[PDB]
Amino acid sequence: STGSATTTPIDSLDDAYITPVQIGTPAQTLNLDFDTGSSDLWVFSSETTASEVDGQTIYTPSKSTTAKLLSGATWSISYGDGSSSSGDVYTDTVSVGGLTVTGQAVESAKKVSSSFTEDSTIDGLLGLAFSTLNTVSPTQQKTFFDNAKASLDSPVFTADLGYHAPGTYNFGFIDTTAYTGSITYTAVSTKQGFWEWTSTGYAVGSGTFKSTSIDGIADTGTTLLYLPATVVSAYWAQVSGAKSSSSVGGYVFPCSATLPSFTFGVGSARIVIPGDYIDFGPISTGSSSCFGGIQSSAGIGINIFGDVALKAAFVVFNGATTPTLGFASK
Numbered sequence: 001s002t003g004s005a006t007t008t009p010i011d012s013l014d015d016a017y018i019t020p021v022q023i024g025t026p027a028q029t030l031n032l033d034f035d036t037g038s039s040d041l042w043v044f045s046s047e048t049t050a051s052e053v054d055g056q057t058i059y060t061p062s063k064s065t066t067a068k069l070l071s072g073a074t075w076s077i078s079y080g081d082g083s084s085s086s087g088d089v090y091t092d093t094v095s096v097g098g099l100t101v102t103g104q105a106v107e108s109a110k111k112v113s114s115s116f117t118e119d120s121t122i123d124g125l126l127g128l129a130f131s132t133l134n135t136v137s138p139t140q141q142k143t144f145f146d147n148a149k150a151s152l153d154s155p156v157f158t159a160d161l162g163y164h165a166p167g168t169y170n171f172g173f174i175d176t177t178a179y180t181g182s183i184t185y186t187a188v189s190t191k192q193g194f195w196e197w198t199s200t201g202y203a204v205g206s207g208t209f210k211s212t213s214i215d216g217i218a219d220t221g222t223t224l225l226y227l228p229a230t231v232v233s234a235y236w237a238q239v240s241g242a243k244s245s246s247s248v249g250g251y252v253f254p255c256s257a258t259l260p261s262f263t264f265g266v267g268s269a270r271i272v273i274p275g276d277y278i279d280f281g282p283i284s285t286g287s288s289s290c291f292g293g294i295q296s297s298a299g300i301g302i303n304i305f306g307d308v309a310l311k312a313a314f315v316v317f318n319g320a321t322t323p324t325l326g327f328a329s330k
């Protein structure tokens with residue numbers, strides 16, 4: 001089998017992307033944030049504290065003839081930015097782009113943090129990291145991809161995120177019309193539960209490529225590109241007036257600037273992030289200080305190849321027995 005679904009930016013900055021997902025019988029369609037940095041499929045629901053729902057579409061398990069309470073199971077997750085959610089668990093039928101999994105764990109939120117309440121466009125998350133990170137207790141549950149994998153034509157999914165435009169998540173096949181040149185594959189460590197890999201270096205603008213190993217994760221659920229302080233300083237030094245602001249929480253730059261591109265290495269291949277992809281706009285409405293899309297990872301403990309980086313590529317998440325990642329230009 002295969003599936004194919006369009007993913008759409010939630011706002012004019014590409015802060016996140018939402019993909020429609022059918023849950024239950026008859027189908028209830030929710031728009032979920034596909035997150036290769038976590039491993040829980042959780043939704044706003046009829047059980048979510050009413051004051052914490054503000055415009056989201058909710059899953060109502062009592063209206064689904066295929067929903068079953070997973071007795072005794074609870075979940076609770078905290079994300080790298082400090083957001084969080086928790087609740088109980090149903091199993092139900094879940095379909096993405098025509099690909100159907102029966103018996104998928106659908107984690108129903110009883111509580112969500114304010115950041116989620118405020119994102120009226122995000123009805124929940126669909127985790128696509130390794131199932132070892134799933135938070136369901138006392139019986140850990142499998143991700144949608146792990147449940148689907150044996151049925152897929154090939155044990156892969158691909159992320160093709162758009163810049164200020166829709167893109168595509170495919171399951172079970174590699175659309176050879178969706179990228180240019182060849183796909184370069186690179187090794188993955190699953191020891192931390194992430195799609196963790198090692199970039200071979202970077203360049204700033206038209207500058208020379210610096211060969212240096214940068215270990216990090218491919219994370220569709222993170223907006224920005226978080227890299228070591230040395231790398232990020234070298235980038236922003238090329239932008240007149242750019243500075244790290246403790247009060248704002250990262251590098252800012254004059255909105256009048258034209259930003260240089262940033263290149264990262266995948267083996268001997270190179271992915272170029274255009275400068276415009278690194279502009280996240282005014283820090284507050286009407287400000288002439290703009291927020292940078294490349295930020296330091298120093299306070300995080302891991303480097304994160306988030307949407308800023310991934311949207312410049314066609315990305316293969318290869319879930320074969322030994323997983324690997326593939327990157328192509330597009």
Ligand SMILES: NCc1ncc(-c2ccc(F)cc2)[nH]1
Nearest residue numbers: 010011015016119122223291
């Ligand atoms: N840097 C602060 C900030 N401004 C907007 C966001 C944001 C992030 C994710 C999301 F889904 C929606 C909005 N974060």
Ligand SMILES: NCc1ncc(-c2ccc(F)cc2)[nH]1
Nearest residue numbers: 033079083115116118119221
């Ligand atoms: N209210 C704005 C906002 N700040 C962080 C988030 C967020 C969105 C998606 C995600 F996966 C994790 C955090 N949204």
